[PDB]
Structures are given as C-alpha cells and as structure tokens.
Amino acid sequence: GIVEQCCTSICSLYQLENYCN
Amino acid sequence: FVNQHLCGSHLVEALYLVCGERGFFYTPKA
C-alpha cells in the first residue's frame, strides 16, 4: 500500500497521484 | 517535498498538497 511505497521506501509524485480522487 | 520518506501526518500533508481540490484517500492498512 501507500505506507510501503511512500513511508518505508521513498515516495514519488507518480505514486502519490494514484491516491487522489 | 515529494521525493523522500513520508510517514504519518507528513504523508497526509503531501497528499493534501498534491491532490488539491480532487481530494484523496489515506488507507494505512492496504
């Protein structure tokens, strides 16, 4: 999930936008 | 501010700024 991709590992704009509505 | 380890309120803040008026969903357990 998001914690695995952005918290435990380095985040990215590409991944962050996957969670916008 | 996006390319780093973002956890908790820090991650929530990033989503808020990036998504803007679109809003977002935060699911820690996924």
Yes or no: say if A5 and B29 are a contact pair by the CB < 8 Å rule: no
CB-based contacts of B20, cutoff 8 Å, min separation 6: none
Radius of gyration for the alpha carbons in chain B, expressed in angstroms and rounded? 9
Length of chain B: 30
Q: Where are the alpha helices (DSSP H) in chain B?
A: 9-19
Interface touch A17/B30, C-beta < 8 Å: no
Distance CA A17, CA B25 (A): 10
Domain positions in chain B: 1-30
Interface touch A10/B22, C-beta < 8 Å: no
Instruction: Using CB atoms, pick whichever of B3, B18, B26 lies closest to residue A17.
Output: B18
* CA closest to B29 among chain A residues: A1
**What method was applied to determine this entry?**
X-ray
